[PDB]
Amino acid sequence: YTKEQCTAAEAQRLAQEIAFGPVVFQVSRLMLKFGIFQLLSGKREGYTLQEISGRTGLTRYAAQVLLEASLTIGTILLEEDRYVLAKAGWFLLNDKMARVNMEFNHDVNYQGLFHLEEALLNGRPEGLKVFGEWPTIYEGLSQLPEQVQKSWFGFDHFYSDQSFGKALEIVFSHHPKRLLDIGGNTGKWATQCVQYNKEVEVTIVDLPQQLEMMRKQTAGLSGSERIHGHGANLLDRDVPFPTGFDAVWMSQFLDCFSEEEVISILTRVAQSIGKDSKVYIMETLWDRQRYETASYCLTQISLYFTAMANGNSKMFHSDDLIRCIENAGLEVEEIQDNIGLGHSILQCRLK
Amino acid sequence: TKEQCTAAEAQRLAQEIAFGPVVFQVSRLMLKFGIFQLLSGKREGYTLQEISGRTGLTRYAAQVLLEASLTIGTILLEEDRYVLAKAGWFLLNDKMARVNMEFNHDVNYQGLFHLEEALLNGRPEGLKVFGEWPTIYEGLSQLPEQVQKSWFGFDHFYSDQSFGKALEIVFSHHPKRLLDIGGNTGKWATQCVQYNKEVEVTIVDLPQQLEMMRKQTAGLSGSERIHGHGANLLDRDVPFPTGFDAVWMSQFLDCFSEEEVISILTRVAQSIGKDSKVYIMETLWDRQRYETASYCLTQISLYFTAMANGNSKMFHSDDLIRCIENAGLEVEEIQDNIGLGHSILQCRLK
Numbered sequence: 091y092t093k094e095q096c097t098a099a100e101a102q103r104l105a106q107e108i109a110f111g112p113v114v115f116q117v118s119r120l121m122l123k124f125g126i127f128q129l130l131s132g133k134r135e136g137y138t139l140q141e142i143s144g145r146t147g148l149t150r151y152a153a154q155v156l157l158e159a160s161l162t163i164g165t166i167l168l169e170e171d172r173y174v175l176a177k178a179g180w181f182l183l184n185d186k187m188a189r190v191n192m193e194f195n196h197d198v199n200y201q202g203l204f205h206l207e208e209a210l211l212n213g214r215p216e217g218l219k220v221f222g223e224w225p226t227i228y229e230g231l232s233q234l235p236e237q238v239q240k241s242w243f244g245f246d247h248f249y250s251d252q253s254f255g256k257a258l259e260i261v262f263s264h265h266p267k268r269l270l271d272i273g274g275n276t277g278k279w280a281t282q283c284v285q286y287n288k289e290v291e292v293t294i295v296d297l298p299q300q301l302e303m304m305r306k307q308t309a310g311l312s313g314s315e316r317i318h319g320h321g322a323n324l325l326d327r328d329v330p331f332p333t334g335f336d337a338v339w340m341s342q343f344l345d346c347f348s349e350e351e352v353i354s355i356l357t358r359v360a361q362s363i364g365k366d367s368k369v370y371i372m373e374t375l376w377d378r379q380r381y382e383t384a385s386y387c388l389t390q391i392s393l394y395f396t397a398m399a400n401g402n403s404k405m406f407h408s409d410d411l412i413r414c415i416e417n418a419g420l421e422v423e424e425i426q427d428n429i430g431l432g433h434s435i436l437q438c439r440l441k
Numbered sequence: 442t443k444e445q446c447t448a449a450e451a452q453r454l455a456q457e458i459a460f461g462p463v464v465f466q467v468s469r470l471m472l473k474f475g476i477f478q479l480l481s482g483k484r485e486g487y488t489l490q491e492i493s494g495r496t497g498l499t500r501y502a503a504q505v506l507l508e509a510s511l512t513i514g515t516i517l518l519e520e521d522r523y524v525l526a527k528a529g530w531f532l533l534n535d536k537m538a539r540v541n542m543e544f545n546h547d548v549n550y551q552g553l554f555h556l557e558e559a560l561l562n563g564r565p566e567g568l569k570v571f572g573e574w575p576t577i578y579e580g581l582s583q584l585p586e587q588v589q590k591s592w593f594g595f596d597h598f599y600s601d602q603s604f605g606k607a608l609e610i611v612f613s614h615h616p617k618r619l620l621d622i623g624g625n626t627g628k629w630a631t632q633c634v635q636y637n638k639e640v641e642v643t644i645v646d647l648p649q650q651l652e653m654m655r656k657q658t659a660g661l662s663g664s665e666r667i668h669g670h671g672a673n674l675l676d677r678d679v680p681f682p683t684g685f686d687a688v689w690m691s692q693f694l695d696c697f698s699e700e701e702v703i704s705i706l707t708r709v710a711q712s713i714g715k716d717s718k719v720y721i722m723e724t725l726w727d728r729q730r731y732e733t734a735s736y737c738l739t740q741i742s743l744y745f746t747a748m749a750n751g752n753s754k755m756f757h758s759d760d761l762i763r764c765i766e767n768a769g770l771e772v773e774e775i776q777d778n779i780g781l782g783h784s785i786l787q788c789r790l791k
């Protein structure tokens with residue numbers, strides 16, 4: 091939260107780091123992929139270049155160039171003539187957030203990021219064009235390569251998934267009858283509800299394609315006779331929302347829409363409902379994080395929406411989201427937050 | 442230099458490393474869109490609104506850059522107005538950072554994505570993002586305008602532009618003829634020919650390259666005394682012209698495999714007398730007085746891997762020295778820290 095001066099004129103080094111981000115990223119990806127961080131992991135004493143070479147079956151050249159570049163980046167150290175894992179390498183190896191983000195940035199983002207410039211300029215996801223010509227990554231998804239899909243789904247899960255105690259005990263503090271979950275195409279949330287309260291009925295809204303997976307994924311889970319799908323297109327027209335729901339829920343949904351789109355979806359939400367029903371918006375807000383690293387990540391992430399999938403959209407700053415809510419005719423009745431990996435929840439109501 | 446440096450904020454680095462490409466593009470545009478500039482104006486800093494208007498960026502387009510940069514740390518927040526930070530300044534005003542950034546976007550960005558295959562297959566798999574000459578050297582004249590600008594800038598900035606020390610190291614032996622291998626801009630030869638009034642300099646490089654150097658050295662002071670010698674430094678078969686009491690290679694040669702180096706250096710060993718001195722001038726990362734320099738040079742080697750040969754690099758000196766000794770020479774003297782971190786090795790047969 092700093093954002094108020096952090097570096098001696100060793101800020102000069104940061105510039106250079108920034109300037110070499112592409113190389114650094116790539117070299118660390120491979121240090122990992124080729125199994126060198128792992129190799130170093132299991133030998134405190136470390137290994138020589140000829141040794142790393144031998145074990146990994148990489149040219150001496152190939153290994154020297156990665157190892158040298160990592161030595162100065164600082165993911166490994168040099169002792170006598172052996173390279174040893176440094177702490178930063180250990181995290182690349184072991185931190186699930188880093189592995190997720192890195193894999194994501196390679197398979198989904200790397201190439202398209204070249205075209206971020208025109209993406210900012212034009213107001214659409216110009217990077218997506220290196221895969222195809224869909225309006226959004228959402229629509230083109232079923233068509234991206236294996237690996238690209240793999241990494242995207244990992245990203246989508248790592249930042250969405252969770253648990254859901256805090257959240258659960260809050261929403262049900264109002265003993266609701268029918269929760270309408272807009273966009274939870276996995277059913278994990280509705281699963282939790284169902285298995286938490288024994289007569290709530292949950293209706294998930296989403297594109298039909300997406301609800302075939304929810305039924306797949308949710309197949310023979312412990313309360314699923316009470317989980318219902320309702321196909322929709324979430325497009326200004328009728329896309330009116332079902333009605334008679336005591337709860338309405340939206341999680342990691344809608345950081346993938348414009349503000350303009352977000353206010354439209356909400357106003358249309360603000361019609362489903364009576365002055366009795368609560369509206370819950372759960373989101374990863376970059377400005378409201380426990381850990382600064384979390385803030386850093388979320389704001390770097392925002393750019394994938396810009397390059398791939400734009401016409402939108404970003405990890406919200408709480409102020410904007412709160413502004414967007416109040417214009418849909420709703421009011422935040424409290425922003426309890428900091429649940430799971432730093433997911434804030436906004437309990438709103440009508441009026 | 443090397444011994445553990447980070448708290449367990451090794452964890453943040455892992456993430457910084459993970460987001461390199463985002464960090465890079467975001468910061469590249471904060472330059473291009475002139476947002477660092479605008480910010481280096483009013484010390485007070487500007488507001489987000491003021492910033493979209495001033496730039497013509499959507500505001501979304503602008504928020505998104507500002508927010509990423511805020512956390513990167515290149516700018517800095519005051520109430521509701523952004524200020525430029527020290528790191529933004531270095532990007533704004535430091536020439537090295539600008540050369541690299543521009544080099545990496547225009548020349549390397551897209552191709553690095555194939556670094557894996559290049560490291561596996563031992564050629565520059567990245568180059569195919571533009572064409573597929575064997576090498577970046579044979580495709581230079583064919584890359585996009587902007588790519589050419591950025592490569593030449595890189596090429597210029599990592600060369601000796603000082604010369605002072607080099608001149609005295611070299612002319613302290615009164616060479617009558619100097620053979621300059623790869624000196625295709627003619628810049629070094631111009632210095633020699635204007636330093637001493639009798640020396641005659643011969644540049645060795647591909648015939649086209651030499652057309653360029655006659656262009657470049659056109660109408661300069663010593664040029665009647667600068668000659669070209671058309672060769673395929675590769676052709677392990679053609680011998681080097683002889684009769685030269687100084688042979689010179691500077692920032693050339695880190696463009697060759699160790700193999701090729703030794704090949705090149707043996708052919709040299711066989712052109713010279715016992716009294717001939719041979720100078721190799723490189724930017725050697727292990728000999729740098731400033732850590733930042735080492736850092737860059739080690740990262741700069743991967744442009745070679747992905748984009749150029751797919752098999753050369755910025756040398757660790759132990760390797761340059763080994764190579765030298767296999768070619769059958771020996772290093773007598775070793776001066777470094779010249780200019781932005783150059784070293785010159787003075788060698789001779791034996």
